[PDB]
Amino acid sequence: PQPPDILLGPLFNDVQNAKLFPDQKTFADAVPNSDPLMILADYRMQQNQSGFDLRHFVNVNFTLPQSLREHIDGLWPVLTRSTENTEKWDSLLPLPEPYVVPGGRFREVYYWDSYFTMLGLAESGHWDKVADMVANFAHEIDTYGHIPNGNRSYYLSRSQPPFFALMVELLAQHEGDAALKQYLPQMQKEYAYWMDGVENLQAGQQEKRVVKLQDGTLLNRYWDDRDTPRPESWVEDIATAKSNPNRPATEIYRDLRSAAASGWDFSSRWMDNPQQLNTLRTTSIVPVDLNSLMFKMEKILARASKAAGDNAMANQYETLANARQKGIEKYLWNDQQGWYADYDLKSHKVRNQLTAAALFPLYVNAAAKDRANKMATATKTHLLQPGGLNTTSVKSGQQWDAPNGWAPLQWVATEGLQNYGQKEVAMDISWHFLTNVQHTYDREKKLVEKYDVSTTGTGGGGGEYPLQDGFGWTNGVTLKMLDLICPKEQPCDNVPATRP
Numbered sequence: 005p006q007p008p009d010i011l012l013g014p015l016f017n018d019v020q021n022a023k024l025f026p027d028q029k030t031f032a033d034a035v036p037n038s039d040p041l042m043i044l045a046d047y048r049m050q051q052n053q054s055g056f057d058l059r060h061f062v063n064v065n066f067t068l069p070q071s072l073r074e075h076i077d078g079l080w081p082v083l084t085r086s087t088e089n090t091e092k093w094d095s096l097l098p099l100p101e102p103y104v105v106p107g108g109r110f111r112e113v114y115y116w117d118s119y120f121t122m123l124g125l126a127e128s129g130h131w132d133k134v135a136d137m138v139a140n141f142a143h144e145i146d147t148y149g150h151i152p153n154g155n156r157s158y159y160l161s162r163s164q165p166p167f168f169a170l171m172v173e174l175l176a177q178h179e180g181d182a183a184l185k186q187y188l189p190q191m192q193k194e195y196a197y198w199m200d201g202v203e204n205l206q207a208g209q210q211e212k213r214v215v216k217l218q219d220g221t222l223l224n225r226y227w228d229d230r231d232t233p234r235p236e237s238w239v240e241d242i243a244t245a246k247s248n249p250n251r252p253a254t255e256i257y258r259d260l261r262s263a264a265a266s267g268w269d270f271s272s273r274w275m276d277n278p279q280q281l282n283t284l285r286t287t288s289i290v291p292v293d294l295n296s297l298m299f300k301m302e303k304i305l306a307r308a309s310k311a312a313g314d315n316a317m318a319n320q321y322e323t324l325a326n327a328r329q330k331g332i333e334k335y336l337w338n339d340q341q342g343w344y345a346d347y348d349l350k351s352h353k354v355r356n357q358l359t360a361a362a363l364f365p366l367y368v369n370a371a372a373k374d375r376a377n378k379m380a381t382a383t384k385t386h387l388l389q390p391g392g393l394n395t396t397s398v399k400s401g402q403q404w405d406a407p408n409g410w411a412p413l414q415w416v417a418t419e420g421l422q423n424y425g426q427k428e429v430a431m432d433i434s435w436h437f438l439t440n441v442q443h444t445y446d447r448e449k450k451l452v453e454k455y456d457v458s459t460t461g462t463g464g465g466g467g468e469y470p471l472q473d474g475f476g477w478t479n480g481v482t483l484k485m486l487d488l489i490c491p492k493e494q495p496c497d498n499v500p501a502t503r504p
């Protein structure tokens with residue numbers, strides 16, 4: 005499958021640049037009614053004729069795309085899609101089983117979203133859907149060599165935060181070690197993708213998603229194999245590169261795509277100047293969340309191997325995990341500030357900024373106990389707000405920043421804090437975010453993609469597209485949290501005004 009900019013060449017550029025549709029993702033998801041080569045020969049003939057209408061040419065040649073608890077349960081069918089077969093030349097990639105999409109403009113499965121959605125499904129006893137989704141991701145691993153950002157041809161050149169091993173662990177909570185052993189080959193295969201290029205890597209060098217520091221420490225980074233505009237945000241990325249003539253455009257395209265591989269598209273976290281997206285430099289930053297996830301993946305791989313009966317392999321994975329933990333503790337802790345943070349390959353130091361990503365070492369149990377206590381303090385002091393956990397302390401105009409609260413980060417933070425007995429802060433995050441979700445639901449009768457955490461009752465904003473409704477990981481995380489804040493004796497269908 006070729007991404008639409010390659011498949012439809014000059015025509016794709018021209019349709020996007022003409023802005024025939026208010027969302028750039030629209031034409032990226034359009035299906036050619038006939039062979040692209042034919043539509044392209046045709047376009048070359050007509051395009052310069054008197055009174056040629058581009059829009060008309062496109063219409064002819066393409067097909068274009070109750071309680072809180074009750075509401076979430078009724079949404080699952082609306083968010084479920086089944087696409088075992090796909091039309092010829094569709095950007096949508098086929099999957100063997102039904103899958104849940106986030107909602108709105110997101111009409112395909114997403115990698116990291118699905119873990120948090122599956123948490124909700126698992127909590128509701130929809131273990132069949134959870135099995136189906138693990139199977140879908142295993143299929144993509146075998147088919148593409150890795151999990152794409154989503155099941156679209158324009159997502160094949162990148163991944164997303166790697167939650168597959170955690171999904172397999174989720175499935176094992178129901179099916180036992182049999183699930184770990186079943187999906188071991190695909191977990192190893194995903195690991196080999198993340199580590200591709202390590203062989204022959206020298207100190208001080210990076211290759212694809214692997215970074216080797218000057219002392220030999222191996223860590224990973226986000227990376228996309230392409231350095232061109234994103235088809236799904238074509239005119240935005242061109243405008244971003246055009247606005248900064250002092251950088252090669254390919255470098256800007258690479259970092260835009262890599263921030264998209266990071267899940268945090270976009271954030272002051274990646275930028276020299278928090279008010280200029282054209283300064284982002286994702287590929288020179290070693291992310292603390294990614295490397296926390298890699299640690300977890302290595303720990304899960306060791307467990308699966310040992311269950312499977314392969315002890316030499318289990319010992320290898322445990323040794324790799326032990327080394328990664330030493331790297332996180334050394335390069336991804338900011339000792340001057342007292343919090344985890346990303347590492348800057350440009351300055352050769354730990355970056356200053358506190359973001360919600362700094363909770364990930366707690367989430368995966370990599371963190372030292374004293375650093376976990378320090379993180380509880382940093383969270384209360386800087387990130388915890390009336391409507392939930394702030395993403396950063398910086399209002400950049402981007403969506404992965406203040407004042408936005410994102411469901412997946414609320415879950416990572418509360419689970420992380422609980423892993424170290426920091427129960428008070430963990431409960432405050434859950435209660436604040438849930439109240440926000442409930443309040444917005446009382447107002448709008450919906451769940452949304454992200455929330456403004458400075459108060460409760462309003463959805464968030466920022467970035468290159470409008471606030472989306474649904475919404476997969478909000479619904480999944482909400483159900484999980486709802487079930488935990490109320491006793492099993494008396495479960496709640498709405499978030500209550502009093503803590504029990």
Ligand SMILES: OCC1=C[C@H](N[C@H]2C[C@H](CO)[C@@H](O)[C@H](O)[C@H]2O)[C@H](O)[C@@H](O)[C@@H]1O
Nearest residue numbers: 106110114117153234237264267268269
């Ligand atoms: O809910 C799906 C998502 C959409 C958001 N990003 C997608 C939309 C971008 C176009 O607006 C796309 O380039 C990116 O790769 C996609 O993952 C969000 O920031 C992601 O963390 C999230 O997984």
